[PDB]
Design a protein around this ligand. Structure first.
Ligand SMILES: Cc1cc2nc3c(=O)[nH]c(=O)nc-3n(C[C@H](O)[C@H](O)[C@H](O)COP(=O)(O)OP(=O)(O)OC[C@H]3O[C@@H](n4cnc5c(N)ncnc54)[C@H](O)[C@@H]3O)c2cc1C
Ligand SMILES: Cc1cc2nc3c(=O)[nH]c(=O)nc-3n(C[C@H](O)[C@H](O)[C@H](O)COP(=O)(O)OP(=O)(O)OC[C@H]3O[C@@H](n4cnc5c(N)ncnc54)[C@H](O)[C@@H]3O)c2cc1C
Lengths: 650, 650, 175
């Protein structure tokens, strides 16, 4: 049976995403083992729409196919989730990149590293902050992001307003407002606003800043000697022409490395409890089998790691037998469970003034800010019942705030609201959830070949139906069910209570302008503010009006207002693309990242995270891959590599 | 290379859908050739949710996974189409069944056969109505549908009203109203309403009825001796336990037939211009190769026939080379082009009355009516500029009308409109498009393995942007661009002008009730009616207000009303699942169904139709497969098989 | 066949099934258990030895399950057989919950003879390749040479008589 594609080795890494390349690179650098990478994708080093950062916004799109890279089946997998019973049963498609570099070839390029507190309070032993912060330093040094290269006065006004009201939040003694950081003290952690003001680094090495108002992010772009920016991503850095031949061999130093471009993997041939081989389909349609000697690594992303595991034989035996899996290995009913993701409701602001163009200048997107102009990361609101115990003594990251010019609601909402993108006296504010509550799971549907869409369940904004039970002991399930909608409403109020300090700051900053939230409607926010400050910590009793027993017309007003307000976060919002926690630590893998019930396979992508980090989930996956390098190799080498040693660029 | 799965033969049929089983059955019945069927799916003969017709509505759904069969990746392929630039860039998922029997295992079971005129005016030579009507008789005899088993007075009232106004439409001499059939004459083709009134057969043998108002459809269910109904579909009839062994062999008469249950096919190994072999992936993940001696047949549905062709090597050489296809055979730039489908905007009716429950009785769905209670099929509206030349002398089928209890708009629209499904004084009317204008195309994205989602483009309700050209010779592109929106608006008016005859009929039928259209809004329909009857055949100039030059406030009223009305068909509607015309006759295949540029492959599913038929597209695909039986075999055998010879049921 | 010779076998079968308990509270159970403990209090006194709410393996305290939130559950089918008289709140039914959310029935054929262990043609699979199961076969009697059973006959679904030899032993599990 003459197949000369004998690619037997000792380590096989599957999926060259944000974590696959880091591992393959630093694994062939520090040892002599024979390494193989399989990705099922070519290298888009020459594509203008990839390498140019501004191509993300559709600058190179043919006029008849105006879709960008997340909606393009030639660039990204297209999985759709089953009807969201919390969002009027609207199915959604969220992508995972299909190329060297994974989703980093198609993403927005932001570098939130996540707070310090999360890795100290939500991760297992060995994964506390002080065990990994060095790895975060390693990756941010390997990329070297940059800051915004353009000033603007709107950032100054907004930072002014936030410090103004953080002054009061510092007083009044309440301990859990959203602008209090405990690692600084009485002084607010708000960046100064004047020429020669220093810059507060969000991703600081010692994690002092978990709540801070700044002016710019750190995007993963570099400037070339010519004057043009390009994209600096995982495949760009760790796997470029200098390190790997066009035929897939490494060069000299890394001669013990093999990369196959287009090879879709199906499952893991598995003798006993010992993985022994892997098969894949090349671009004819042939099945090639390769031996594994020493270990197998799975870096296939959040959606497609549990899936390949389940086809392999690890999962729920009853289910996999039901749908027709012939070979069964380990009976873990938790594989593909506990899926987590962020979520960002959207609001926009109207400015009334004859010459407000002077106010909104220098807001357009360049390859250094990518339309991001701030503003800060906030903590828990004062009136949110779902806070951990440590909230009295440690500050947690809850909301990530973003400001952007133009309007960003969906087109149907644009038509409905009466405000369009043509006019230029409008801008958008976003209060992202980082601690988003809902949880889902992933189930395969056919044991034949890797399918683009497996069963993915994710219900977010569900409702609570009261029972005949006495009110006293049914409240603490209403709390658990209504957490996310409460969080979104509190984000709305938090953004709302900024615009008045912004009014004052603009008035005495040389601007006769007026600021106002028009989406959601003005009245529907003033009523929420009044209801909050008149009903206190028991404001959220009124989501269910049959239990408050408050038949006063004021109570009916509050119930109706919350009913209407519950509509906006369902439709006028944007599910993010930060999928994580499919095979988390403890649930499916141990703290050394090995799969329970087997001795020589590990999962090391973002699916293995036991909690979503404090922001955009790119650094985290790379960190996990980097740490996996050490755990596989045995001794810390990437650990204290000097920071002046960085991969060369080509 | 020891693979004992040597399944070399002379005919291979790929995809056992509405046309695959008919062909395989009648092909092994009338000859001695060795036949093989490949489907990639098991047989759901025992599943309650399949066999019970009422299971279509989710009677056997577990409470945690309340999705039915079209949204279930274990039952149906899930392809999503790229953003619809006409529908606010809303991607949609439409399914194709994955089982023996294809989409017939998951469909609504209706038997519109299509008008006679369409097969006479829109199909090639050899496919005129009188060449095939016998095949339609054959399939309807092989199924034996039934009628509704429950009377209701709403049907009587609506038929009464339609005859009342068809009386006037018969007079006034205008030739192209929607209730004029030319094969009957002065008398309306409206079914009589009293006890002992005869039944007008919609699917009549000689095609006299192309416009007719009736009371019931023909669904594909049978009643068992016990008292329970089951589903009678393609796999149920042609491939059941009586004809095929559980091991896939045929029995006696059909001993020369092989069926493999779970086998996903990839592409066609293709020596020279002669197809020679086919490969597939079983439920391990193995590649099995089978020889073909004599011919290859493709019955893989509208979405996945052009795709397997393109992976095979037939298509646009530049494109397939671009995305990495190594072997190229024939350069046909039309493969996967010309996609067609129906579309059904929705409206609902309010009834005001103290005891209207007496009016709406006996409307619930049973397995014989499946919530369908009429009402008729109509022709072109009087004021639609896009009519063929033959409209003066032949009547064409345009709208298929349906009445149903309850509300059927989407949930978000339900909340927006203020009317919900709990209350019971409301019902739905649907004016389906059968001659829907927009056209799209299908392109693969990766030459590795059959993917669930390839590039599918389908833009429906686009808008026209005027240029600086003089108005005189830019109108007849505005016409072509605005056809479908005009059609939807005219359907709205057609339904609207029925409710007043319904008012009169109810008043003097023993009912003191009131009928009114509340969705879309009452005023927004009365204004459209007035605008139509005051502006005449030039009512559709006002879609673009910059060219009418009518600055009168009446003209501004008309423009604003049409602008608002253009919103409802975009969102409050339902794209159907009748995909067709991917490899039509002439475009990709000849009239003998062979693929241009090759001698021994054919495509015979609904993708090969050169025009969408006059209604639900199930009979048509089976008819095409049945005719293919004759073309392959050479002499007409299924042609005059006596109608008393029918497959036995088990 | 005394208890201590078999209790292990009972454990084996209950482990092979893994029943479940009731998944729904109710206050009628609480009221009735309350009443039974109330009168078992008196039955414990008065010295009579053979009332219906006296268990001797517990002593003066009644064997009545507690009624409040966080009350433990008295296992009726306990391994060491202490509870021969006890008032509880729920039984152990032989149903399982599937990952979807639907319950199914867990019975003898479901467990010991399912698609994983036996082919659709009646053969066992691998480990159990030395096993044969015939689905529709009504047995009539035991062909019986001397005092030694030697064969058995049965009627299949045509109506034919098939005879099979026995070498070593015959077992009757016909109810
Ligand atoms: C639309 C979008 C927006 C984003 N925005 C941001 C942002 O603002 N900030 C930020 O920090 N990050 C952003 N990201 C990136 C994202 O948050 C993370 O970078 C992502 O989780 C990367 O983690 P990963 O490497 O584990 O996943 P991936 O990069 O998806 O790794 C999966 C890899 O495995 C391959 N693979 C999958 N299945 C198979 C198979 N069967 N066989 C072989 N190979 C396979 C895939 O092709 C891919 O190369 C965005 C991503 C997207 C898609
Ligand atoms: C939601 C829904 C509603 C419907 N409603 C109606 C209705 O009201 N009235 C009506 O008359 N009809 C209805 N239908 C049926 C539909 O209109 C037609 O019956 C359909 O076009 C059947 O035609 P077909 O056999 O060519 O397609 P299919 O039945 O889809 O045939 C395709 C077959 O090929 C198989 N296949 C596909 N790709 C591969 C591959 N790579 N390898 C192997 N096998 C493959 C599929 O599994 C399937 O068995 C409905 C269908 C759906 C899904």
């Amino acid at each position: 049976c003459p197949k000369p594609e004998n690619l037997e080795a000792d380590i096989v890494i599957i999926g060259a995403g944000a974590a696959g390349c880091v591992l393959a690179y630093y694994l062939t650098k520090f040892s002599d083992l024979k390494i193989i990478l399989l990705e099922a994708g070519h290298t888009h080093f020459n594509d203008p729409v990839v390498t140019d950062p501004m191509g993300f916004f559709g600058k190179y799109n043919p006029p008849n196919e105006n879709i960008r890279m997340s909606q393009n089946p030639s660039y990204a997998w297209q999985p759709a989730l089953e009807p969201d019973t919390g969002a009027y049963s609207m199915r959604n498609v969220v992508a995972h990149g299909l190329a060297v570099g994974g989703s980093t070839a198609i993403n927005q390029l932001n570098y939130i590293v996540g707070g310090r507190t999360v890795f100290d309070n939500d991760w297992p032993t060995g994964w506390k902050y002080d065990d990994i912060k060095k790895y975060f330093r390693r990756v941010l040094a390997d990329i070297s992001p940059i800051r915004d290269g353009t000033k603007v006065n709107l950032t100054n006004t907004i930072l002014e307003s936030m410090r103004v009201l953080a002054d009061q939040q510092v007083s009044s003694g309440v301990p859990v407002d959203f602008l209090i950081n405990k690692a600084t003290g009485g002084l607010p952690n708000i960046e100064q606003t004047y020429q020669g003001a220093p810059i507060v680094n969000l991703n600081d090495y010692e994690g002092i800043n978990s709540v801070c108002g700044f002016k710019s992010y750190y995007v993963g772009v570099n400037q070339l000697s010519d004057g043009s920016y390009i994209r600096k991503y995982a495949g760009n850095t760790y796997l470029n022409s200098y390190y790997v031949d066009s035929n897939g061999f490494g060069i000299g130093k890394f001669s013990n490395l093999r990369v196959i471009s287009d090879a879709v993997v199906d499952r893991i041939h598995f003798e006993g409890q010992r993985a022994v081989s892997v098969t894949y389909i090349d671009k004819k349609g042939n099945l090639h089998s390769v031996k594994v000697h020493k270990e197998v690594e799975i870096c296939s992303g959040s959606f497609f790691t549990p899936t390949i595991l389940q086809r392999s034989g690890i999962g729920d035996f009853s289910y996999l037998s039901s749908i027709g899996v012939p070979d069964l290995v380990y009976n873990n009913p938790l594989v593909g469970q506990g899926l987590r993701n962020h979520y960002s409701p959207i609001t926009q602001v109207s400015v009334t003034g004859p010459d407000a163009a002077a106010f909104l200048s220098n807001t357009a997107a360049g390859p250094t800010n990518m339309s991001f102009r701030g503003a800060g990361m906030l903590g828990y609101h004062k009136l949110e019942p779902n806070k951990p115990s440590n909230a009295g003594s440690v500050t947690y990251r809850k909301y990530e705030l973003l400001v952007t010019g133009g309007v960003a609601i969906s087109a149907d909402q644009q038509y409905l609201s009466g405000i369009s993108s043509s006019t230029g006296n409008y801008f958008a504010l976003i209060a992202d959830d980082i601690r988003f509550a809902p949880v889902g799971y992933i189930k395969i549907g056919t044991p034949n070949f890797p399918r683009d869409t497996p069963k993915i369940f994710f219900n977010t904004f569900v409702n609570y139906t009261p029972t005949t039970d006495p009110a006293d002991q049914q409240w603490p399930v209403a709390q658990k069910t209504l957490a996310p909608l409460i969080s979104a409403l509190l984000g709305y109020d938090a953004i709302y209570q900024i615009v008045q300090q912004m009014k004052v700051v603009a008035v005495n900053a040389g601007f006769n302008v007026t600021l106002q939230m028009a989406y959601p409607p003005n009245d529907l926010l003033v009523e929420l503010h009044n209801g909050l400050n008149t009903y206190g910590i028991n404001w959220w009793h009124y989501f269910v009006p049959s239990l408050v027993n408050d038949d006063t017309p004021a109570g009916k007003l509050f119930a109706s207002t919350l009913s209407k307000l519950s509509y906006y976060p369902r439709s006028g919002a944007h599910l993010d693309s930060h999928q994580s926690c499919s095979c988390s630590i403890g649930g499916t893998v141990d703290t050394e990242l090995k799969v329970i019930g087997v001795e020589n396979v590990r999962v090391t992508d973002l699916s293995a995270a036991p909690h979503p980090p404090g922001g955009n989930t790119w650094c985290t996956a790379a960190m996990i891959g980097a740490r996996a390098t050490d755990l596989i190799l045995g001794k810390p080498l990437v650990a204290n590599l000097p920071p002046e040693d960085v991969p060369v660029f080509t």
